[PDB]
Amino acid sequence: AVKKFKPYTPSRRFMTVADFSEITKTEPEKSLVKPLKKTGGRNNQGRITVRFRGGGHKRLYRIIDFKRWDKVGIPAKVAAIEYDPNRSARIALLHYVDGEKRYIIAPDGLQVGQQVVAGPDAPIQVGNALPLRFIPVGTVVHAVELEPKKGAKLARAAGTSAQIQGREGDYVILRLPSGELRKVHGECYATVGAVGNADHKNIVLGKAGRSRWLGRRPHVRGAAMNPVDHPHGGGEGRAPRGRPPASPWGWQTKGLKTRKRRKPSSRFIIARRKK
Amino acid sequence: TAYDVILAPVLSEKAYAGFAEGKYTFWVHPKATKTEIKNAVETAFKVKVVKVNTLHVRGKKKRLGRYLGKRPDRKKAIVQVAPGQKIEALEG
Amino acid sequence: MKRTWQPNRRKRAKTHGFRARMRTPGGRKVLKRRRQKGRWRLTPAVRK
RNA sequence: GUUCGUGGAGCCAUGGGGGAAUCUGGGCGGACCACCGCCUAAGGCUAAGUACUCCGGGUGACCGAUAGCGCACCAGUACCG
RNA sequence: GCGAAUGCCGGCAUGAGUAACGAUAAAGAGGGUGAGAAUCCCUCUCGCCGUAAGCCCAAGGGUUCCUACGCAAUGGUCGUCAGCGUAGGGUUAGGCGGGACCUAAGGUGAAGCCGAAAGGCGUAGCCGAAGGGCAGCCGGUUAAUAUUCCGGCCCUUCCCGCAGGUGCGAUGGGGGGACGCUCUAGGCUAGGGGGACCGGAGCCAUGGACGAGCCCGGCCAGAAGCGCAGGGUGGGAGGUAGGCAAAUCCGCCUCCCAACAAGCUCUGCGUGGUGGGGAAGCCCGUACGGGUGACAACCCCCCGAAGCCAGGGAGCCAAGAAAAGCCUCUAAGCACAACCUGCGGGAACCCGUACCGCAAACCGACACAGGUGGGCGGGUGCAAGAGCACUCAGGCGCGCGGGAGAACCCUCGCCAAGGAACUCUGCAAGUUGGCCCCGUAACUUCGGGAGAAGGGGUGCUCCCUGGGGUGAUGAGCCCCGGGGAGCCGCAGUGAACAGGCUCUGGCGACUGUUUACCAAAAACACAGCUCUCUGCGAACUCGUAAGAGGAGGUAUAGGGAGCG
Numbered sequence A: 001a002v003k004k005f006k007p008y009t010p011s012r013r014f015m016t017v018a019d020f021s022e023i024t025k026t027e028p029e030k031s032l033v034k035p036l037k038k039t040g041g042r043n044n045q046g047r048i049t050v051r052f053r054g055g056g057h058k059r060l061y062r063i064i065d066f067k068r069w070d071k072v073g074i075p076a077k078v079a080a081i082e083y084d085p086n087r088s089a090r091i092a093l094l095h096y097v098d099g100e101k102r103y104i105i106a107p108d109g110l111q112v113g114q115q116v117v118a119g120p121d122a123p124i125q126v127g128n129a130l131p132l133r134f135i136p137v138g139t140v141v142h143a144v145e146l147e148p149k150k151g152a153k154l155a156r157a158a159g160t161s162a163q164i165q166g167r168e169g170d171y172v173i174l175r176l177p178s179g180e181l182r183k184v185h186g187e188c189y190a191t192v193g194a195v196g197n198a199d200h201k202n203i204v205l206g207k208a209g210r211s212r213w214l215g216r217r218p219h220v221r222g223a224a225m226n227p228v229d230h231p232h233g234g235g236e237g238r239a240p241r242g243r244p245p246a247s248p249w250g251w252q253t254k255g256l257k258t259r260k261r262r263k264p265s266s267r268f269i270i271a272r273r274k275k
Numbered sequence B: 001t002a003y004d005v006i007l008a009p010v011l012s013e014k015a016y017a018g019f020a021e022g023k024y025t026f027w028v029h030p031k032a033t034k035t036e037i038k039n040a041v042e043t044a045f046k047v048k049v050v051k052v053n054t055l056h057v058r059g060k061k062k063r064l065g066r067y068l069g070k071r072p073d074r075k076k077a078i079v080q081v082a083p084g085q086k087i088e089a090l091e092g
Numbered sequence C: 001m002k003r004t005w006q007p008n009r010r011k012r013a014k015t016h017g018f019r020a021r022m023r024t025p026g027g028r029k030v031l032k033r034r035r036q037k038g039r040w041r042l043t044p045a046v047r048k
Numbered sequence D: 001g002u003u004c005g006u007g008g009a010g011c012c013a014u015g016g017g018g019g020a021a022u023c024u025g026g027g028c029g030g031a032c033c034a035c036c037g038c039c040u041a042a043g044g045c046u047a048a049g050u051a052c053u054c055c056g057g058g059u060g061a062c063c064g065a066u067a068g069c070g071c072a073c074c075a076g077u078a079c080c081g
Numbered sequence E: 001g002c003g004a005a006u007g008c009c010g011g012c013a014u015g016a017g018u019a020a021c022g023a024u025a026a027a028g029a030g031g032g033u034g035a036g037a038a039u040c041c042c043u044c045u046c047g048c049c050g051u052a053a054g055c056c057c058a059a060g061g062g063u064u065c066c067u068a069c070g071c072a073a074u075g076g077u078c079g080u081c082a083g084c085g086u087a088g089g090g091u092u093a094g095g096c097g098g099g100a101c102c103u104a105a106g107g108u109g110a111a112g113c114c115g116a117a118a119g120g121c122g123u124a125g126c127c128g129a130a131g132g133g134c135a136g137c138c139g140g141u142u143a144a145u146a147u148u149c150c151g152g153c154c155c156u157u158c159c160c161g162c163a164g165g166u167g168c169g170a171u172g173g174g175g176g177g178a179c180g181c182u183c184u185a186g187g188c189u190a191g192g193g194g195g196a197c198c199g200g201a202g203c204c205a206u207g208g209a210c211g212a213g214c215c216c217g218g219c220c221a222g223a224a225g226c227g228c229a230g231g232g233u234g235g236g237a238g239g240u241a242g243g244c245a246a247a248u249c250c251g252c253c254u255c256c257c258a259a260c261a262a263g264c265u266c267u268g269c270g271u272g273g274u275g276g277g278g279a280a281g282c283c284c285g286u287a288c289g290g291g292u293g294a295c296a297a298c299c300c301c302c303c304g305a306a307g308c309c310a311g312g313g314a315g316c317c318a319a320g321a322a323a324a325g326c327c328u329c330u331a332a333g334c335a336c337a338a339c340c341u342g343c344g345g346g347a348a349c350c351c352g353u354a355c356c357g358c359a360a361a362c363c364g365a366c367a368c369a370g371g372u373g374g375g376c377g378g379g380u381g382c383a384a385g386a387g388c389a390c391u392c393a394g395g396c397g398c399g400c401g402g403g404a405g406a407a408c409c410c411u412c413g414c415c416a417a418g419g420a421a422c423u424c425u426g427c428a429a430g431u432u433g434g435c436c437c438c439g440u441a442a443c444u445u446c447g448g449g450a451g452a453a454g455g456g457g458u459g460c461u462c463c464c465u466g467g468g469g470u471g472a473u474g475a476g477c478c479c480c481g482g483g484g485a486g487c488c489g490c491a492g493u494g495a496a497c498a499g500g501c502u503c504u505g506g507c508g509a510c511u512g513u514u515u516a517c518c519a520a521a522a523a524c525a526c527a528g529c530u531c532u533c534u535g536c537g538a539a540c541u542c543g544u545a546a547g548a549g550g551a552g553g554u555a556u557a558g559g560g561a562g563c564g
């Protein structure tokens, strides 16, 4: 389940490590389809924009091809399940009958050597890529696509799974892991089953490290600021919050619908968020 | 234009110690080339040279009175001559 | 402690050099003010 | 912009919206209407007279090495950054 | 028209022959040069560093390096000396470090995008290094150059002619190059310690000693080949849509076989043709140093690395660059060409090269008690060790000294009796201190507190004995011990390096970070918890915009806020 530790040192009593049991399929990593160095930069051309990112360990990018129309109707063979520090889920080093190396994120419960095909002529088993009009209703599904022939973007984190809640003509209604009933189009691809690695919630980072290992700089709190930077800063001995709730750029941080109201990607949702 | 060559032998004590061997060192043009020196000595002196070796001499800063300047920046070369024959014009 | 001027040939050459002036719109202002003032060394010379 | 700062606010160019006519067609004479006068816009060029002195020379109720340009001298140099 | 503006500029005063003369490592003496010597040169003693106050490089500085002649000025004094002045020399590279090779962050930048203009993004490509690849080791020579000059010896690139063989050939494809941290098994090397063995000029001091007596050195480099230790690699046949396919190459599936192996390739070490070095001591010694003592010896044993085999093995999560050389297959092209291996002959280019480089030459206005990256960095004893004490090779006595030995300042040592009574406070100082052996509480998140607190021993001599490693099974040599018998001193880690402890509360969970240069904290951060927003051309941020961060991420993710 969870790899734990007895508190032989402080800042080790609560530090839990995820189970490295599916990683036994390959101990090294195939250096064929991942040559691209991930240039790890927290900033744009000069300015730190996303505040407190960077640092950490050197990380190498794994080129995935989630465009499952790369080979339509060509079966595969899941031969390895390996680690991926970019995504939050372990990926599946799978070969082809054609013989082409391919990295796909591993769904919930893969093994070694089963057959999986990225085509519409595929029965319902966990791994296959099928269009949403060919997905049956009620079946859990992940790696679904918003607008067709644009890859696979929705529900790719660990343990998450979208679910078909019915059909409305040409657009299918599926709920996302937030609980937002959204319609998408019917020939974009989708991989059934949950993603897995559902122990990703249950891990505890432990010390101040494993944030500095992963590359999150120390997120300084706003109540200890100065009034030059933050509206909450200053005050003689922790002054209370200065009558807003606020971000460091003025806009209210608790309860502000900052979504673009007249966005053309609207009109498809028939729900907003499950509470 | 023959873009010509050697200014002067350096007439030093190590030069006259290299006079017993086939060394025969001299100053050159500061933008010369180690093949161009072999081309210069083997045609201007009618000899055969095995191994030219050059080195770039930086001039010393030097003054006369209260006005400081520097001596020029110039290159020095040695020429390893093929045995048997030598030069019979450098007898300083 | 460290003093402010820790010298460096390549940092001085790529920082205050002639092309380090001439690739900027303000370095041409420098190279048109040093000539009007009449400096003998228009760019800080790096000794080789 | 013209003296014009929205005032009765013309004229000259226009960022946007509507939008024609070719001498019985138009613009102007300071909200505007009629008469009466001036001129042809929506294409372009044009010397001469006017400003200034790196430089050349002549002059000065201009100065005479703490003056005069920062430098009468091997000065935008030595030196500082 | 000057006397004032804490006016300015230049000169000269007071402070005054006053403080200081720059780490409290230390100087003394005899000769020589010289007009002049505590300071320059030589010799004999003493002291200091010796994980450097020694040596080798990269930074940095730019002739400061050497010789000869001098003290106008400088050296916190003098100075005949000088890193000071004048003149003359000195840096030698196919193999060392860079370019003619490549690439990362980043920069420039064909196409393209945006912006009043200057300009700003930006694919391909280019630049970009203490990153990858690439062919050199030993010794001598000068006053100054040495992996460069020379002596030995081994290699690399390119071209030409010949011999043999081949379907040769890319800016194309493919494998490899290609990588984390910690612990590390085996062998070797660097380095080091002994020997009754080898060689050497000498000595028997002062009481004893002509002997396993004292002292010094017992090496380095080295091609082919041969041994030792490792690393890499399954050998063939067919099919295959893929390598933004052109493939016999690679990937996938069927394998008669081999399969912890062996074969074939790649390194390191030893031996190896041979070459070089060869002391301590003694004569000639101005300096420098030269002959030396040899026909020099150049043997054996042990300790042993962080270094090499290396891309070894095991464990862990935080998951650990790119491209080029080189190996292979082909497209256009060429197959009288082109490529590979030998045999002989040629060519190998541009820059750096001196000196200081943990300081007097770098940065600090200074010959400044500050700071400056990498490597070697010995020996003996303290359990160990780059710590401590001393000392090899190497340097140095710190560029003002000599008297007296007042108060007073700094540093250090000691003290009858009291033992914190002084003070805002055991502030400071002092004790404990290292190792081995018994013992260790309240309380708890069962780890910890804890080295709790408290104690006993530590020196030397002899005898017996358990072993382990190398060596051969032990003789020899190192390491871990145990018991008994004694001996001396007040004291036995006899010197130096080395915890004061306990109880009780406050605050912060803890490690860590900050107010460079008056505040290291009850301040910041932290894991974790909660709220809110964001479904993607996301939210939010920078930018007029393009665009970029987010992110080559997807509500188990990201942004903001609060408590911690």
Ligand SMILES: [Mg+2]
Residues within 6 Å of the ligand: A032
């Ligand atoms: Mg590859």
Ligand SMILES: [Mg+2]
Residues within 6 Å of the ligand: A211, A219
């Ligand atoms: Mg956090």
Ligand SMILES: [Mg+2]
Residues within 6 Å of the ligand: A224, A225, A226
């Ligand atoms: Mg504050």
Ligand SMILES: [Mg+2]
Residues within 6 Å of the ligand: A228
């Ligand atoms: Mg600020």
Ligand SMILES: [Mg+2]
Residues within 6 Å of the ligand: A227, A230, A231
């Ligand atoms: Mg504010």
Ligand SMILES: [Mg+2]
Residues within 6 Å of the ligand: B054, B055, E093
């Ligand atoms: Mg050279």
Ligand SMILES: [Mg+2]
Residues within 6 Å of the ligand: D004
């Ligand atoms: Mg107006």
Ligand SMILES: [Mg+2]
Residues within 6 Å of the ligand: none
């Ligand atoms: Mg108008």
Ligand SMILES: [Mg+2]
Residues within 6 Å of the ligand: D014
């Ligand atoms: Mg308009």
Ligand SMILES: [Mg+2]
Residues within 6 Å of the ligand: none
């Ligand atoms: Mg009008």
Ligand SMILES: [Mg+2]
Residues within 6 Å of the ligand: none
């Ligand atoms: Mg009008």
Ligand SMILES: [Mg+2]
Residues within 6 Å of the ligand: none
């Ligand atoms: Mg006109």
Ligand SMILES: [Mg+2]
Residues within 6 Å of the ligand: none
């Ligand atoms: Mg004039």
Ligand SMILES: [Mg+2]
Residues within 6 Å of the ligand: none
């Ligand atoms: Mg003047």
Ligand SMILES: [Mg+2]
Residues within 6 Å of the ligand: none
């Ligand atoms: Mg006068």
Ligand SMILES: [Mg+2]
Residues within 6 Å of the ligand: none
């Ligand atoms: Mg300067």
